[PDB]
Amino acid sequence: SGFRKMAFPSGKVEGCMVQVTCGTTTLNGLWLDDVVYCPRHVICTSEDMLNPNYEDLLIRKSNHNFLVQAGNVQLRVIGHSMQNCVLKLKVDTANPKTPKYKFVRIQPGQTFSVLACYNGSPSGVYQCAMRPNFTIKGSFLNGSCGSVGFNIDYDCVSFCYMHHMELPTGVHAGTDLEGNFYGPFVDRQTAQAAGTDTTITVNVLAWLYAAVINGDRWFLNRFTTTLNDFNLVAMKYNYEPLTQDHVDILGPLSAQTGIAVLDMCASLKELLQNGMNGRTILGSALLEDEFTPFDVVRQCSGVT
Amino acid sequence: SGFRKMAFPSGKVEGCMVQVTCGTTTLNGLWLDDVVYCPRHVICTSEDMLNPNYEDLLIRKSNHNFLVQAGNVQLRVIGHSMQNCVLKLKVDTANPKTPKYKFVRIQPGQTFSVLACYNGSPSGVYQCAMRPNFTIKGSFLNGSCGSVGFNIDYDCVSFCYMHHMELPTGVHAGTDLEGNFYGPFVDRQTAQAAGTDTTITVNVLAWLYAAVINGDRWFLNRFTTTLNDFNLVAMKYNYEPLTQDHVDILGPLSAQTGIAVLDMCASLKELLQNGMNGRTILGSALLEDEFTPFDVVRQCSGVT
Ligand SMILES: *[C@](O)(C(=O)NC)[C@H](C[C@@H]1CCNC1=O)NC(=O)[C@H](CC1CC1)n1cccc(NC(=O)Nc2ccccc2)c1=O
Ligand SMILES: *[C@](O)(C(=O)NC)[C@H](C[C@@H]1CCNC1=O)NC(=O)[C@H](CC1CC1)n1cccc(NC(=O)Nc2ccccc2)c1=O
């Protein structure tokens, strides 16, 4: 049994990761078929970062300015296109190991695997969630940019994130693979703080269900509640408003544990109102909100 | 910046994972060159599990009893050998994608990546530590057995663990790739509980150093201490005795933060004696002991 923060295998993505060099700047690229994707700020100097005009910066740039390196192989750029905040570089080769793939923009609450890369080479993989504020709590050093976040349907890799910037609080922002930022952020060295970081209620309820499954159950109260009731408690503790689909979604888990959603909503309610009082649910001494109902099911089923 | 529990890329290991079927039982195998490694309890029936005599069970078994499946390919077994609690199956093919590899037995405190597998296909990867008791806190369902834990030196994969059983408390035990159990455990369905789970002191000190680096510093006290002093506090809170090498090892971190080891030993000392009082160091409301000094450095350097 047992339960951990666990990421999708990285093998399929690994072999799509290449180094991109334009001038001084060097960051990571995603190579699918004969296109290579990268953050457009690869063309920016440090003096530009303050206030860049990417179109204008693009004038002076040509195919030959972009050094794309796949291990020890210098892919020939033969065409370059900007899309929102991504650069796409047409190359003369197709990636032999392009998998079945897709670009998806995820909703806030949804989780993905992040393969961290420095110089086209992967350092590590870790799982995180798209937070309500639209930020992520990543692990990212200078060089990391152009790393991507993904899910797999054991066949088709789904690309949701590409990393661009770090923010106050030491959190992160980035783009879908069409280069639109999650959240009202821009690629610019300017003051742009995050909003209020709210907790993903449904995700916690899943974590609590995962505890029951596993055996931790001390938090299980004898009371029930209402949706309206609980949502009136939730806003006080900056949790996200729990809806009916959210209820629907927790059904299978409810099914498996024989604990109605709304009873679990009341177990949580007291934990908000009374804290864990220095006990540990599933190892954590905090309420974990970075597991989707699906993420739990994956792990309490053995899906591959 | 930011800091996460992060696992080595799984790509190289992924392509060494195969399904092994002997009778009803079906578990995972590691295929390197022309040998396939699996837990020997693949030859056990449920009636055997109670008390198995593997030698005796082996008599009735032949090369043709072991179905090794690499995706949709039925590797020909041509020789079978038992080593402690592992089965090695000689096959007529070499694994095309065998990486530079090694078998290492790790010490308690050392961490590795676990690639969880069901039916030769990987479900997920996650990082955990070999605990002082010699157990691991894994995520493992029936089917998981024969999954392996590894580190990579970005070249050479080092194999340290292969998963066999789950224990009371919902923790796990297993073997090096030579099939010797970590800890005084046997492959048998019998009563065999773990010992006292102690905390890996040095690992926590690293986590604390990772906080300072990142920016969390509220726990930094104005006091210092002694090794003997702190170790007298540690035993009370079931932490591992901190030694001089452990001090030596924390040097680079000390170097980077300009905080002597022994000052950090005093910051910890109060946290033991006073608890976090419902604050969060690096997201966790608990003292995290599953990061090696090296693990921190990797992540606060960008090693690949
Ligand atoms: C990325 O460009 C890269 O890897 N390039 C090789 C880089 C990655 C980040 C740096 C360290 N960790 C990271 O995730 N990101 C940037 O340098 C980024 C460039 C974007 C396009 C404009 N960037 C530039 C300038 C400033 C910041 N962030 C801050 O300094 N913000 C901040 C202000 C106050 C307090 C805390 C943070 C930035 O991310
Ligand atoms: C493994 O054999 C497998 O995957 N086979 C296909 C399997 C994996 C575990 C089952 C669920 N999670 C796991 O990690 N392990 C076993 O079945 C294992 C076999 C070993 C060789 C003897 N095994 C058999 C019998 C009993 C246990 N453990 C317990 O039931 N122990 C226990 C007692 C009391 C309280 C809690 C646990 C066992 O692991």
Author numbering:
A (entry chain A), B (entry chain A): 1 to 304
Task: Provide the publication's sentences verbatim.
The main protease Mpro is a clinically validated target to treat infections by the coronavirus SARS-CoV-2. Mpro cleaves the two polyproteins pp1a and pp1ab, which are translated from viral RNA, at 11 conserved sites and is essential for viral replication and multiplication. The active site of SARS-CoV-2 Mpro features a catalytic dyad comprising Cys145 and His41, with Cys145 being covalently bound to the N-benzyl-α-ketoamide in 13b. We established structure–activity relationships for the 13b series by modifying residues at the P1′, P3, and P4 sites.
Because the urea group is a bioisostere for a carbamate with enhanced stability, we prepared a series of ureas comprising 16a–e and 17. Analogues with substituted urea capping groups showed similar trends: The introduction of phenyl or benzyl groups attached to the urea as in 16e and 16d, respectively, led to an increase of potency with IC50s of 43 and 49 nM. This was rather due to the phenyl group and not due to the O → NH replacement because the latter alone had little impact on activity, as shown by the comparison of 6a and 16b. We therefore expected that this part of the molecule was amenable to larger structural variations and prepared the two subseries 12a–12h and 16a–16e. This yielded the most potent Mpro inhibitors 12d, 16d, or 16e in the 13b series of α-ketoamides that all exhibited IC50 values < 50 nM. Compound 16e also has a superior Tm value (73 °C) among all the analogs. Among the tested compounds, only the ureas 16c and 16e had half-lives > 0.5 h, whereas all other compounds, irrespective of high or medium plasma-protein binding, had half-lives < 0.4 h. Plasma clearance was high, except for 16e, for which a moderate plasma clearance was observed. Although the in vitro ADME properties of the α-ketoamides were promising, our in vivo PK data revealed a high clearance, which was only improved for the urea derivative 16e. The urea derivative 16e also exhibited the highest plasma protein binding, and it is conceivable that this property is important for protecting against clearance.
